[PDB]
Every structure is written in C-alpha cells, then in structure tokens.
Assembly symmetry: C3
Homo-oligomer: 107 residues x 3
Amino acid sequence: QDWEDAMETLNDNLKVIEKADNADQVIAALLYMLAAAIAAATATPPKLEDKSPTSEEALAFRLGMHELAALITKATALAYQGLVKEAQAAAEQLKTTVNAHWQKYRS
Amino acid sequence: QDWEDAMETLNDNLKVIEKADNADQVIAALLYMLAAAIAAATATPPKLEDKSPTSEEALAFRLGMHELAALITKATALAYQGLVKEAQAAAEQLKTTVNAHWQKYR
Amino acid sequence: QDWEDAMETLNDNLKVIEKADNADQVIAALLYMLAAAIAAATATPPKLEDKSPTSEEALAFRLGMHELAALITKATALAYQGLVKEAQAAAEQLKTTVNAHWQKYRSAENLYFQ
Ligand SMILES: [Ca+2]
Ligand SMILES: [Ca+2]
Ligand SMILES: [Ca+2]
Ligand SMILES: [Cl-]
Ligand SMILES: [Cl-]
Ligand SMILES: [Zn+2]
C-alpha cells in the first residue's frame, strides 16, 4: 500500500459515488476513500522520496492529505443524513482538491 | 480550511447534539464535528501565526485537535450502539475540550 | 499510561470483533478501535519518553498509529457493506499489525541485560 495505490483508490471510489443510486453505496465508497486518505498520509509520494520527513514540505503533504480526510468525512455526514445528491455534489467538488494533491506530488 | 469556521462548526453541532432525539441525529452531528476537527488541525490558528509550522507548539496544537477527533469518534461509537444519553454526555465533555482549545488558540 | 491504555482498548475490541454475530457489533467495535488509534497517536509510548516530540522517531510512531487507523477504517467500510466475515478477517490481520507496533514501542525493561 503505497501512495499511488491510495490515490488510485480515491479515483476509483469517486467514480463509484458518481454512479451510485443510494446512500449505503455512497457511504461505503466514502469509507474506502477515508481509509485511503489516512493511508496516503503515512506514505511517501515520489516528489518526497528523499526529503526529510520532518521537513516543512513533508508536513505540508501530510496536512494536505488530512484536508482530504476532512472533506471526505463531511461528505459522509451528508450521505448519512440521506442527502445523497448533496454528498455526490460534495464528492465531485473534493475531486478537484484530490486532483490538486495528486498533481503536486505524483511522478 | 480556516480554524475559526471549524470552531463555529464544532459549536453549532454541539447544540444540535444537545437537542437531538435519536441516535442518527447524534451520529450525523458528530460526523460534522469530526470533519471540522480534522480540518482545524490543518489550519494555523491566530496564536500560532508567529511560529514555525514545524515547531513544538504547532505540533502540540495538531495533537490537541487529534485528541478532540478521538473523543468525537468514541462518542460516535456510543451513539452507534444506540446509547444516545451516553453519547450526549460524552459530547458535554467534548464541549469543555473545544472551549479550552478555542480559548487557548484564538 | 495513555499509550498502553489505547493498546489495551485495541486488543479488547479485536476480541469483540472475533466473537461478533452481526455487522453492527463489528462496526461499533471498530469505531472504538478507531478512537483508540487516534488517541494513541497523541500519546507518548515508553520507547519515546526521552525523545523530542518533533523528532523523526516520534513522527514515525505517529505515522504507524495512523497506519492502524487506516486499516481499521477499511475494515469499517467492509462491515458497513455487510461483509461481516470479510471485516472479521481484516481485523485478524489488523491484530498482527497492532502486535508489531506494541512490541516496537512498549517498555523493554523486563528484557534488559538478558
Ligand atoms: Ca496502482
Ligand atoms: Ca503498489
Ligand atoms: Ca459563520
Ligand atoms: Cl487523523
Ligand atoms: Cl475474549
Ligand atoms: Zn492525523
């Protein structure tokens, strides 16, 4: 379970959420995303492979992954309330923040 | 994410929890609190604007927010078991922790 | 005592999961585990009592606790889907990682000079 694997899991579950039809499928997908976001914050992306883990740059990376976890959790709260369309809209929005982090640290 | 709005979200959802009649209302509110607590730990509160992000003081702030997330999650477990009164009581203790954190870092 | 207490909570709920008969029992236990894993990442284990909290070694400990939280959350996703046997199997795998972390960071005082 490396960083790219966690990012792939985020991508795959975003596509599941977009096609889902009920709250339970959305919530399951968001829980898998939350697990991947937490895992990604413990992993080292390509751009940081030889950086000091206590560097400001590495801390910023980990905080960015926590930002994703916060957005995923808020979308989970919406879906738990039965606001499924709202949770799907929230997932579509956080896709862009996930993409920002993916593009910043990949390769 | 910004720290002040996360604190407001925590405060708002504590009041939702106090008024709640069933476990699902409590769980949803706790999930909004958990998202806010996670978000708050990625921000720099006013008291830390003059400190390095890698400082001991900034780490203590982020660990404090993680402590809050841990308490929220435990209250969520209680509410998931249908222990609404116990979850509301855990949330009352949560309020003290949130208040203290707000006063320390505002 | 905070770190040891959280490790005890993890172990206690792994047994709950092993004995569970439905998804809701597993989910509640995993949520208690997730709370304990998050709490443990704010604690200082015996092996780190003399180290700077901003040290690389303290950070590696906190990341190891986050690794547990990620595994617990994945098991929660399985149980939320109703895949109870699968979540219980994930929890058994989790026990191995919990034990590894416990052995790494617990006090080794009883083994000194053996
Ligand atoms: Ca892959
Ligand atoms: Ca791989
Ligand atoms: Ca406002
Ligand atoms: Cl976290
Ligand atoms: Cl037992
Ligand atoms: Zn964290």
